[PDB]
Amino acid sequence: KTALEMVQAAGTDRHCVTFVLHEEDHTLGNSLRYMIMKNPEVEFCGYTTTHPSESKINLRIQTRGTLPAVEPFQRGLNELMNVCQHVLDKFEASIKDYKDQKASRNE
Amino acid sequence: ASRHGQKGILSRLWPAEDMPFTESGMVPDILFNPHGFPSRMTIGMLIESMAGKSAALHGLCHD
């Protein structure tokens, strides 16, 4: 019933793990790939969809300098939430400053 | 098929958000391979494409 699997490199290596994100596509995995690549503790972050008939993405996160790849994945999720909350705030504050000039101009 | 004798078989129904949208806002409707042309030499599908695009943009029907 869960919707994230983690597939290690050799059962012991925790730097490379390929996250299998169930019920996603290039909507999330292209913007996660954008955030995790902004982390200088990542040698390699890329994604692929497994097969278009399927509904999951593979996400290879490959960390240099002794970190597990759960930390760039969590940081790239929170660091995308903190993009979208701010985009939501500056969008709900420019719709409001447009309705407050459509109305309060000549009416 | 088309009207220039160029059969296709329907291979994959591609979801709409994945289609290459244009600069006008439009997605396409059928994607056609550029490797169906050079052995078949249907120039008439090129002129029909320009012609039908320019007829749908003007309200004309082209001869």
């Binding site: - | 806002g25 439009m26 396409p28 409707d29 749908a56 943009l57 003007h58 309200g59």
Partner: protein
């Protein structure tokens, strides 16, 4: 047969623009101005209403 409710390419409701397009062509507009003045700006939306053979006024003649 009858006008589609949505344009095929992008999902714009063009299915309400068939009577108010016959009404513009009966009132002497050109088809290059009866489609812009209905708000069909993309050439996939114009295509649905310019090249439409409304083949149900010919098919209801065979009625009980």
């Amino acid at each position: 047969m009858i006008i589609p409710v949505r344009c095929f390419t992008c999902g714009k409701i063009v299915g309400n623009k068939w009577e108010a397009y016959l009404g513009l062509l009966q009132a002497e507009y050109t088809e290059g101005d009866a489609l812009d003045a209905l708000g069909l700006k993309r050439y996939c939306c114009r295509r649905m209403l310019l090249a439409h053979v409304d083949l149900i006024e010919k098919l209801l003649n065979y009625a009980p």
